Amino acid sequence: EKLSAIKKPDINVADAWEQYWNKTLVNSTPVLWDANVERAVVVDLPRFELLFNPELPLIDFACGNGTQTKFLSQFFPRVIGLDVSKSALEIAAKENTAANISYRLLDGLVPEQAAQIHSEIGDANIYMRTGFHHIPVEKRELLGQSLRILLGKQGAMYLIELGTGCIDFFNSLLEKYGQLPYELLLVMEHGIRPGIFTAEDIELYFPDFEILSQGEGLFQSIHKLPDGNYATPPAFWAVIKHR
Ligand SMILES: Nc1ncnc2c1ncn2[C@@H]1O[C@H](CSCC[C@H](N)C(=O)O)[C@@H](O)[C@H]1O
Ligand SMILES: [Cl-]
Ligand SMILES: [Co+2]
């Protein structure tokens, strides 16, 4: 049935995502957001590469299976891929390893883990591709805390999320074709739902941050529509740094 903007299934976020990734690992099923780098991080990198100090470590926050992480590691001297899911990192460590990548478990909803990481590496820059929009609204402040801790004063963060129009976009597919995309259903099977992240959310969760640059555009999925084009929901992106 139809996706809701407000109402959502109540989940344990860590558990739901590990269930999804373990199912993905075991069964080798498609991953909705796992677009080839040329349509993903290659599009992102020009938006932040001239703004990040490359002497800081780079964190791929919520790195999933590491597809984007591998590319980042070809451009930055030191990359750390963080994810809540051990199965995600098991795929990453097999398919997307490099001498200058470390994959490490971390739960963004437990800010003490971010504190531990920052105590080891200092201020880090952050790349985050769709790490926020699916987080239940009532848990978002915890993730903001984690991010604030990792960035400190000198770090900058580029994030790209599903933006305003996300739910309408998916519901129009449902209306036009009678079901949601297979690859989206694969995630929703676990109680996970896509959501919306906006400029107003940057102010809400990061009032102590400056927006260096922002925009909208499209987010690239691997779901092919009947005309042969890929489904591309609306995106919101920003580069932010502590004021
Ligand atoms: N609480 C949390 N802490 C850290 N990562 C989390 C998290 N909740 C979900 N995630 C991770 O967020 C990712 C969203 S899917 C996007 C993955 C990756 N950035 C890419 O673009 O390919 C998943 O890998 C999921 O396991
Ligand atoms: Cl939770
Ligand atoms: Co502050």
Side-chain angles (χ1 to χ4, degrees), residues 3-5 8-54 56-93 95-111 113-174 176-243:
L3 284 171
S4 173
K8 309 277 191 172
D10 189 10
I11 52 168
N12 182 299
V13 169
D15 288 353
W17 279 99
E18 170 57 26
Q19 194 190 49
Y20 169 78
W21 278 119
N22 195 250
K23 172 197 70 200
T24 303
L25 172 59
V26 173
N27 298 287
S28 298
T29 47
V31 175
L32 174 69
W33 52 83
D34 194 23
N36 55 295
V37 293
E38 298 86 356
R39 299 192 290 127
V41 68
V42 162
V43 168
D44 300 320
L45 185 54
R47 296 165 177 175
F48 66 93
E49 64 183 318
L50 305 183
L51 302 173
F52 277 20
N53 170 358
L56 303 179
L58 180 58
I59 290 169
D60 187 347
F61 192 92
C63 65
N65 61 1
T67 304
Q68 311 309 317
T69 320
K70 180 60 167 167
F71 171 100
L72 289 173
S73 80
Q74 290 152 335
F75 286 80
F76 288 85
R78 180 188 181 186
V79 178
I80 300 162
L82 298 177
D83 204 279
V84 75
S85 171
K86 65 177 175 183
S87 293
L89 299 183
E90 183 175 335
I91 303 164
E95 304 307 328
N96 288 301
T97 53
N100 66 328
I101 295 171
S102 299
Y103 288 111
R104 173 158 175 178
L105 286 169
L106 177 140
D107 188 338
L109 302 184
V110 187
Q113 296 184 16
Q116 178 58 51
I117 284 276
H118 184 280
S119 71
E120 296 171 28
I121 71 170
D123 291 355
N125 292 317
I126 296 171
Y127 173 81
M128 187 174 72
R129 183 175 183 265
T130 49
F132 230 135
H133 74 90
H134 54 79
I135 301 285
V137 168
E138 67 275 15
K139 289 160 179 166
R140 286 177 175 195
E141 164 66 13
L142 291 166
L143 180 53
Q145 292 176 204
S146 292
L147 295 166
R148 173 180 291 96
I149 291 166
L150 294 169
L151 289 160
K153 185 67 173 53
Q154 303 182 50
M157 172 165 58
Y158 172 85
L159 73 167
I160 183 176
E161 296 295 333
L162 300 190
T164 304
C166 173
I167 300 306
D168 286 346
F169 174 86
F170 286 117
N171 284 338
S172 301
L173 291 176
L174 180 50
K176 182 172 194 168
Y177 304 108
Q179 42 168 44
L180 292 167
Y182 176 53
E183 304 87 344
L184 176 59
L185 288 174
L186 288 176
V187 206
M188 296 175 45
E189 193 63 54
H190 303 283
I192 297 155
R193 297 289 180 271
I196 304 157
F197 195 89
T198 71
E200 292 68 26
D201 289 314
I202 297 295
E203 177 62 25
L204 178 58
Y205 302 112
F206 304 105
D208 48 340
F209 284 66
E210 191 185 354
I211 300 173
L212 303 187
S213 177
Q214 65 176 293
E216 296 183 349
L218 302 173
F219 185 80
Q220 302 278 327
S221 87
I222 67 158
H223 181 74
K224 287 196 186 61
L225 297 167
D227 68 3
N229 297 307
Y230 289 106
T232 61
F236 164 79
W237 65 266
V239 179
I240 73 173
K241 186 169 183 289
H242 196 290
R243 72 189 184 166

